[PDB]
Amino acid sequence: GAMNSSNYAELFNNDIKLFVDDTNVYRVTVHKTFEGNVATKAINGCIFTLNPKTGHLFLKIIHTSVWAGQKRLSQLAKWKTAEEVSALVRSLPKEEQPKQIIVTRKAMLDPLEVHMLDFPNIAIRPTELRLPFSAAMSIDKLSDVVMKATEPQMVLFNIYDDWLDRISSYTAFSRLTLLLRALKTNEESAKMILLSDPTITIKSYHLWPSFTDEQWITIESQMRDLILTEYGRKYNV
Amino acid sequence: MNTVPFTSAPIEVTIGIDQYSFNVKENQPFHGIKDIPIGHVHVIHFQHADNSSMRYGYWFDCRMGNFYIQYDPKDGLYKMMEERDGAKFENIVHNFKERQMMVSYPKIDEDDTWYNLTEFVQMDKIRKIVRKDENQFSYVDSSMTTVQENELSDPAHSLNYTVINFKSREAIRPGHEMEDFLDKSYYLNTVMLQGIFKNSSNYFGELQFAFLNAMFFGNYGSSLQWHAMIELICSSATVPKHMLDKLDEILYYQIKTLPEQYSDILLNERVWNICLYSSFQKNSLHNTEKIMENKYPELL
């Protein structure tokens, strides 16, 4: 059933699983038409398919051309997500295929169950966790590859960079969800925290800066403070 | 007009014949039901006074043989049996009739209710859902599980309704996942109507039979089957006009006949709200929508 606080450690066991987030699949700007009506213009999107254990990210870029002449786009986006996840699983070798797929939004369960009928042994699960994977497009390099795409494209990243050399999956996932939670609450402030010291850079083959273990503690602390400040404002408490 | 004689009534029991029912006292000189309309299936059904659990009964058609009821004190129930000796049977009936120990099937002349509930129900189709090929009549009770319920455990005592599963390879063509899930027309028209049932009459007969089993026995899997067969039609954008017209009539008489006090257990809120208000056929069930709105507005 549903993935929650009670069964959190299951994410870091040796059964292959993937999170699927469809938040950024269908993206629009709303604008006024000449006649003063409202219209949307789609922009490039992406499916966020993450192995929480390894950090392997399957960033499937959703090019605006997939919406051309289609109706009920927010509905179609869920089925297009399920089609692309199904295709990704079918493309993996058997020993790499997940045992579970966890969807971050319950509206993905039926579309993904129906697309995965050929895989009865792959459990499709919801989550009670409020995961901040919507903020993936606040990671400059993921944002850059999505917006530059001129056709459908699958790009592979490790969202943990080289962290697993020094820390466990559990700690790497906590760090990723804290960074994404900060980027989601106050993007400008989060990004300032991450680059404020010019001497710490992002390696060409990484997404995040090359922080020492002590600098990660300072950053993580600054991210927790940012999140509470913002929460104090939101709620006046 | 045909007769089902009873050897006796040794235990106190509420006897049903179709939509009618009669209380019989322990050792009351009751010897059966006469004037049963030829041309329809019928169901005789039982609920013991001393254990109102296990409603059970027999689907039969009087054109297929001479049937009687006899209490078996070992198995503790009223059993249907066939009398193969025509002259013995007519002589039993004529005697009981002369001594007026039979109740008369109480059909009002104006009243087409039983015809309307059984319009497409065929005894040969019942015998394929309820497999006991040595009898011409079919036993059903409250507790018998369906083949679908058993998959998700004695196959001999199963109800073999056609399995309907909206999230199955049977229901979803590879590469038409979204189309077939949101518009079940291919599942209804190609798989079920052309493929399995062959025609809408067999589909309606199973639907009507699932309903009657739900209503007369409180058979839970029958209720699931009735709702599934309604939902498959309502969730299809493309249905022949004649099927929609007939479905409205079928459902109207089912809703009309349902005991008012059983709508809480026998009717599924989600299916009915979806079929009448959200589905493709939301506007195609005028009679059904009007009786549901006027008789069960709480459920909606």
Side-chain angles (χ1 to χ4, degrees), chain A residues 139-165:
Chain A
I139 301 168
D140 286 321
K141 289 191 185 182
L142 305 183
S143 189
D144 282 347
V145 71
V146 169
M147 290 319 282
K148 291 195 226 282
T150 60
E151 42 185 331
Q153 197 189 338
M154 168 67 89
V155 189
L156 302 194
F157 298 93
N158 192 321
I159 202 157
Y160 295 160
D161 294 341
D162 66 341
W163 305 342
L164 293 190
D165 294 350

Short mmCIF file of all heavy atoms in Angstrom, two decimals, chain A residues 139-165:
data_model
loop_
_atom_site.label_atom_id
_atom_site.label_comp_id
_atom_site.label_asym_id
_atom_site.label_seq_id
_atom_site.Cartn_x
_atom_site.Cartn_y
_atom_site.Cartn_z
N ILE A 139 16.84 23.16 -10.31
CA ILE A 139 18.25 22.72 -10.48
C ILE A 139 18.62 23.16 -11.89
O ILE A 139 18.00 22.69 -12.85
CB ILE A 139 18.45 21.21 -10.27
CG1 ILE A 139 18.02 20.78 -8.87
CG2 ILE A 139 19.89 20.81 -10.56
CD1 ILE A 139 17.94 19.29 -8.70
N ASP A 140 19.54 24.13 -11.94
CA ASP A 140 19.89 24.92 -13.15
C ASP A 140 20.17 23.98 -14.32
O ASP A 140 19.61 24.19 -15.39
CB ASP A 140 21.09 25.81 -12.88
CG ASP A 140 20.73 26.99 -12.01
OD1 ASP A 140 19.62 27.55 -12.19
OD2 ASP A 140 21.53 27.32 -11.12
N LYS A 141 21.03 22.99 -14.14
CA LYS A 141 21.40 22.08 -15.25
C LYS A 141 20.19 21.24 -15.74
O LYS A 141 20.20 20.88 -16.94
CB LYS A 141 22.59 21.23 -14.81
CG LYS A 141 23.89 22.01 -14.71
CD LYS A 141 25.10 21.12 -14.54
CE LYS A 141 26.35 21.94 -14.34
NZ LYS A 141 27.55 21.07 -14.20
N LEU A 142 19.23 20.86 -14.88
CA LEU A 142 18.03 20.08 -15.33
C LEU A 142 17.10 21.03 -16.09
O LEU A 142 16.65 20.69 -17.21
CB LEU A 142 17.29 19.46 -14.12
CG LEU A 142 18.15 18.58 -13.20
CD1 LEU A 142 17.28 17.96 -12.09
CD2 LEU A 142 18.85 17.48 -13.97
N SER A 143 16.89 22.21 -15.53
CA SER A 143 16.13 23.32 -16.15
C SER A 143 16.72 23.61 -17.54
O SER A 143 15.94 23.69 -18.47
CB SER A 143 16.14 24.57 -15.32
OG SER A 143 15.23 25.52 -15.87
N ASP A 144 18.05 23.70 -17.64
CA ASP A 144 18.73 24.08 -18.91
C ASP A 144 18.47 23.01 -19.99
O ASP A 144 18.13 23.41 -21.13
CB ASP A 144 20.23 24.33 -18.68
CG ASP A 144 20.53 25.68 -18.05
OD1 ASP A 144 19.61 26.53 -18.03
OD2 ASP A 144 21.66 25.87 -17.53
N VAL A 145 18.59 21.72 -19.66
CA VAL A 145 18.47 20.64 -20.68
C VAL A 145 17.00 20.56 -21.09
O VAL A 145 16.72 20.51 -22.31
CB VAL A 145 19.07 19.30 -20.22
CG1 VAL A 145 18.27 18.56 -19.12
CG2 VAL A 145 19.32 18.40 -21.40
N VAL A 146 16.07 20.70 -20.15
CA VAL A 146 14.62 20.72 -20.55
C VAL A 146 14.30 21.86 -21.53
O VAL A 146 13.68 21.60 -22.59
CB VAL A 146 13.71 20.75 -19.31
CG1 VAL A 146 12.26 21.04 -19.69
CG2 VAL A 146 13.81 19.43 -18.60
N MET A 147 14.70 23.08 -21.22
CA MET A 147 14.29 24.29 -21.98
C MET A 147 14.98 24.29 -23.35
O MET A 147 14.34 24.73 -24.33
CB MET A 147 14.60 25.56 -21.20
CG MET A 147 13.68 25.69 -19.99
SD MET A 147 11.96 25.22 -20.38
CE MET A 147 11.40 26.70 -21.22
N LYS A 148 16.18 23.74 -23.43
CA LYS A 148 16.93 23.70 -24.72
C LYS A 148 16.47 22.58 -25.66
O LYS A 148 16.84 22.60 -26.85
CB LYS A 148 18.43 23.55 -24.46
CG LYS A 148 19.11 24.77 -23.83
CD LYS A 148 20.64 24.69 -23.95
CE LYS A 148 21.38 25.04 -22.67
NZ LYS A 148 21.44 26.50 -22.45
N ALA A 149 15.71 21.60 -25.20
CA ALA A 149 15.37 20.40 -26.00
C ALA A 149 14.50 20.83 -27.17
O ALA A 149 13.57 21.62 -26.96
CB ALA A 149 14.68 19.35 -25.17
N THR A 150 14.81 20.33 -28.38
CA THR A 150 14.06 20.62 -29.63
C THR A 150 13.26 19.38 -30.06
O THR A 150 12.49 19.49 -31.04
CB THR A 150 15.05 21.15 -30.68
OG1 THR A 150 15.99 20.10 -30.86
CG2 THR A 150 15.78 22.40 -30.23
N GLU A 151 13.40 18.27 -29.33
CA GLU A 151 12.70 16.99 -29.59
C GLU A 151 12.62 16.19 -28.30
O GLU A 151 13.33 16.52 -27.35
CB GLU A 151 13.46 16.14 -30.61
CG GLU A 151 14.97 16.13 -30.39
CD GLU A 151 15.72 15.39 -31.48
OE1 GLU A 151 15.14 14.47 -32.06
OE2 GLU A 151 16.88 15.76 -31.76
N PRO A 152 11.76 15.15 -28.22
CA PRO A 152 11.75 14.24 -27.08
C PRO A 152 13.15 13.66 -26.81
O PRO A 152 13.84 13.31 -27.73
CB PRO A 152 10.76 13.14 -27.47
CG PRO A 152 9.78 13.87 -28.37
CD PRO A 152 10.63 14.87 -29.14
N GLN A 153 13.57 13.67 -25.55
CA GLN A 153 14.96 13.28 -25.20
C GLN A 153 14.93 12.71 -23.79
O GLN A 153 14.21 13.29 -22.98
CB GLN A 153 15.83 14.53 -25.24
CG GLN A 153 17.32 14.28 -25.30
CD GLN A 153 18.06 15.59 -25.10
OE1 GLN A 153 17.52 16.67 -25.33
NE2 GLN A 153 19.29 15.49 -24.59
N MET A 154 15.70 11.65 -23.55
CA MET A 154 15.93 11.04 -22.23
C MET A 154 17.36 11.39 -21.84
O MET A 154 18.23 11.20 -22.69
CB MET A 154 15.76 9.52 -22.31
CG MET A 154 16.24 8.81 -21.07
SD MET A 154 15.19 9.20 -19.68
CE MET A 154 13.97 7.91 -19.86
N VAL A 155 17.54 12.03 -20.69
CA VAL A 155 18.88 12.43 -20.15
C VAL A 155 19.04 11.76 -18.80
O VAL A 155 18.09 11.87 -18.01
CB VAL A 155 19.03 13.96 -20.05
CG1 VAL A 155 20.46 14.38 -19.70
CG2 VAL A 155 18.61 14.62 -21.35
N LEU A 156 20.21 11.13 -18.55
CA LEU A 156 20.51 10.40 -17.30
C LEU A 156 21.39 11.29 -16.42
O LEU A 156 22.35 11.90 -16.95
CB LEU A 156 21.24 9.09 -17.61
CG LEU A 156 20.51 8.10 -18.52
CD1 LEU A 156 21.20 6.74 -18.45
CD2 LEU A 156 19.04 7.98 -18.15
N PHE A 157 21.03 11.41 -15.14
CA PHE A 157 21.89 12.11 -14.15
C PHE A 157 22.01 11.22 -12.92
O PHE A 157 21.23 10.29 -12.77
CB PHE A 157 21.28 13.44 -13.76
CG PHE A 157 21.12 14.45 -14.87
CD1 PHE A 157 19.93 14.53 -15.58
CD2 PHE A 157 22.12 15.36 -15.15
CE1 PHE A 157 19.76 15.47 -16.59
CE2 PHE A 157 21.96 16.30 -16.16
CZ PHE A 157 20.76 16.37 -16.86
N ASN A 158 23.02 11.48 -12.12
CA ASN A 158 23.00 11.07 -10.69
C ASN A 158 22.66 12.32 -9.86
O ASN A 158 23.54 13.22 -9.69
CB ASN A 158 24.30 10.41 -10.26
CG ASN A 158 24.12 9.75 -8.91
OD1 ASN A 158 23.46 10.33 -8.06
ND2 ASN A 158 24.67 8.56 -8.75
N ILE A 159 21.48 12.35 -9.25
CA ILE A 159 21.04 13.56 -8.51
C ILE A 159 21.81 13.70 -7.18
O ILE A 159 21.68 14.73 -6.51
CB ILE A 159 19.52 13.58 -8.30
CG1 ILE A 159 19.06 15.01 -8.04
CG2 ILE A 159 19.14 12.63 -7.18
CD1 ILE A 159 17.62 15.27 -8.36
N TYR A 160 22.61 12.72 -6.81
CA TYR A 160 23.42 12.78 -5.57
C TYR A 160 24.87 13.12 -5.92
O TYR A 160 25.73 13.04 -5.03
CB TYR A 160 23.42 11.45 -4.85
CG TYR A 160 22.10 11.00 -4.29
CD1 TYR A 160 21.93 9.66 -4.01
CD2 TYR A 160 21.06 11.87 -4.04
CE1 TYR A 160 20.76 9.17 -3.46
CE2 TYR A 160 19.86 11.39 -3.51
CZ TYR A 160 19.72 10.04 -3.21
OH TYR A 160 18.58 9.49 -2.72
N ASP A 161 25.16 13.47 -7.18
CA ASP A 161 26.59 13.66 -7.55
C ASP A 161 27.38 12.47 -7.00
O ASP A 161 27.04 11.34 -7.35
CB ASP A 161 27.09 15.04 -7.07
CG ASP A 161 26.42 16.21 -7.77
OD1 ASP A 161 25.85 16.01 -8.86
OD2 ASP A 161 26.45 17.30 -7.22
N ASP A 162 28.45 12.72 -6.26
CA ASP A 162 29.38 11.69 -5.75
C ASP A 162 29.13 11.47 -4.24
O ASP A 162 30.01 10.85 -3.62
CB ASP A 162 30.82 12.13 -5.98
CG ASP A 162 31.25 13.36 -5.20
OD1 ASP A 162 30.40 14.13 -4.72
OD2 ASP A 162 32.46 13.54 -5.07
N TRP A 163 28.01 11.97 -3.68
CA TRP A 163 27.76 11.91 -2.21
C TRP A 163 27.84 10.47 -1.67
O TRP A 163 28.25 10.29 -0.47
CB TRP A 163 26.42 12.52 -1.80
CG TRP A 163 26.14 13.93 -2.21
CD1 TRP A 163 27.03 14.89 -2.62
CD2 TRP A 163 24.84 14.54 -2.30
NE1 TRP A 163 26.38 16.04 -2.91
CE2 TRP A 163 25.04 15.86 -2.73
CE3 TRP A 163 23.53 14.10 -2.07
CZ2 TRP A 163 23.98 16.73 -2.96
CZ3 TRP A 163 22.49 14.96 -2.29
CH2 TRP A 163 22.71 16.27 -2.70
N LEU A 164 27.45 9.47 -2.46
CA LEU A 164 27.34 8.07 -1.95
C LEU A 164 28.74 7.53 -1.62
O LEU A 164 28.81 6.54 -0.88
CB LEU A 164 26.61 7.14 -2.92
CG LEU A 164 25.12 7.42 -3.15
CD1 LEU A 164 24.49 6.29 -3.93
CD2 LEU A 164 24.38 7.62 -1.81
N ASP A 165 29.81 8.17 -2.12
CA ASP A 165 31.21 7.86 -1.70
C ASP A 165 31.40 8.12 -0.22
O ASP A 165 32.34 7.54 0.36
CB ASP A 165 32.24 8.71 -2.44
CG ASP A 165 32.27 8.39 -3.92
OD1 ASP A 165 31.63 7.40 -4.30
OD2 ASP A 165 32.90 9.16 -4.69
#
